[PDB]
Amino acid sequence: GLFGAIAGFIEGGWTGMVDGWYGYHHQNEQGSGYAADLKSTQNAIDGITNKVNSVIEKMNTQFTAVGKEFNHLEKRIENLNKKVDDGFLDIWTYNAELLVLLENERTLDYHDSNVKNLYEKVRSQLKNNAKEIGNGCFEFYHKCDNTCMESVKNGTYDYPKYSEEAKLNREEIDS
């Protein structure tokens, strides 16, 4: 996608993460499971919600009766009335069709952007304490218990606390 994450370097989705649009999967010694990122999800929900209401509510039509009646000697104005109706028909149809197409595209990109940013936000925290193993996963160079994992999801990961352990395992693994 526009930003390369969804259907990109994160190849597929998670039917197991049911509580949010974007989120996290972890596996450590004490367990494994999914957790939605609640903040980024709510924010995205707020954006799309606002978008839907805009497309719907900015249309404020008045009370009208479309039909018009003309006698057999009023064909010219009957064709004018039809030209009006057909002109309106053509416009709304073109504009609605393109509108939906354009915003659907903008919507998918948006999700794509959001995932990338989440991934980047974690990478920026983890730095050299983990290995980017592709497909959106980071493999930690140190033991990460449930407390540690949560700090990452909450954005308070302590890089210096684990940097030593990681450096040992990083230069050990890289021989």
């Binding site: 009370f63 009766a65 479309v66 039909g67 018009k68 009646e69």
Partner: protein, 55 residues
């Protein structure tokens, strides 16, 4: 030409008399006079649906 067996014709006319105004009819023949007329208040503008759809 005979329509519904008639070679004659009847033209139908209408007007809206304002409150307080008088309308006068004068004739020496050929007048289909009103018998019932209609007091009414027109509201805005609707239209006429021509359909078999049931009410």
């Amino acid at each position: 030409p005979k329509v519904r067996d008639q070679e004659g014709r009847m033209n139908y006319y209408w007007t809206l008399v304002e409150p307080g105004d008088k309308i006068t009819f004068e004739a020496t023949g050929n007048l289909v006079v009103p018998r019932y007329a209609f007091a009414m208040e027109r509201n805005a503008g609707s239209g006429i649906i021509i359909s078999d759809t049931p009410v």
